[PDB]
Amino acid sequence: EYPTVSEIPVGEVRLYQIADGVWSHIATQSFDGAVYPSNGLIVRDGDELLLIDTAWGAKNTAALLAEIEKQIGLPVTRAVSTHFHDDRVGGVDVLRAAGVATYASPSTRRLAEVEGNEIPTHSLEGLSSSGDAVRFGPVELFYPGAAHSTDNLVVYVPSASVLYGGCAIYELSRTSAGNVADADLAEWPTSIERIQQHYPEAQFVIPGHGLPGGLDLLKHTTNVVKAHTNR
Ligand SMILES: O=P(O)(O)Cc1cccc2cccnc12
Numbered sequence: 714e715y716p717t718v719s720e721i722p723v724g725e726v727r728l729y730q731i732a733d734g735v736w737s738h739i740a741t742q743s744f745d746g747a748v749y750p751s752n753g754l755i756v757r758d759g760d761e762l763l764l765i766d767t768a769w770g771a772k773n774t775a776a777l778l779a780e781i782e783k784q785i786g787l788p789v790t791r792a793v794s795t796h797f798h799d800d801r802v803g804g805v806d807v808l809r810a811a812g813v814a815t816y817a818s819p820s821t822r823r824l825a826e827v828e829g830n831e832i833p834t835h836s837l838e839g840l841s842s843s844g845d846a847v848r849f850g851p852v853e854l855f856y857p858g859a860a861h862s863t864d865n866l867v868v869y870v871p872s873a874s875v876l877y878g879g880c881a882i883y884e885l886s887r888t889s890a891g892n893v894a895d896a897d898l899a900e901w902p903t904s905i906e907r908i909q910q911h912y913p914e915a916q917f918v919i920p921g922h923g924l925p926g927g928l929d930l931l932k933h934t935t936n937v938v939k940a941h942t943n944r
Pocket residue numbers: 749880887890891892893921922
């Protein structure tokens with residue numbers, strides 16, 4: 714039922730309704746000879762939509778906008794990028810050209826600029842310290858501490874009990890670490906524990922890539938990260 718890579722031609726995007734007014738968007742990207750899925754979030758806010766993360770690239774993100782327009786038909790007014798990598802900011806320029814106000818933390822914006830990646834326009838205040846949370850439209854933004862990257866944010870939808878982990882949370886099928894070049898392996902388990910302590914009532918947990926699940930995905934990611942730490 715949840716889409717996988719073989720259902721998704723490159724450059725195309727699928728939407729998946731998780732709860733009332735809450736969808737994930739799923740896309741694919743090729744890299745180093747393999748094909749990866751990637752998730753983001755869509756949250757209804759009255760008669761508009763809040764977008765969480767791009768669909769990994771300009772072409773995917775334009776297709777994302779066209780699919781939202783076709784299937785939902787409400788305007789995407791704001792977007793939040795949860796860290797500075799391409800699967801999160803790649804396509805910000807397409808969003809901005811479409812009239813979407815793009816947002817990220819000051820930490821993410823600076824890291825994106827140093828990396829030469831696209832830079833969300835607006836800066837999100839109140840997220841500079843581990844454990845910081847701010848309301849942003851229909852969601853709560855949470856900075857749990859460094860994990861997959863030093864800037865990674867997670868997103869909770871209290872109306873639907875949906876926790877979106879971004880790349881800081883692995884799907885259960887992943888038994889080994891992915892790209893950890895920008896990770897803080899020493900702090901990743903502690904950051905996950907902050908997520909667990911702050912959202913123990915979460916019912917749906919969306920990883921940055923692959924299949925959603927329950928709160929078990931948090932301990933799963935800790936297990937994998939700790940195993941990678943020990944080589
Ligand atoms: O950097 P990541 O972890 O978020 C995504 C990622 C990077 C490198 C290898 C992977 C293998 C499977 C799934 N994802 C992979």
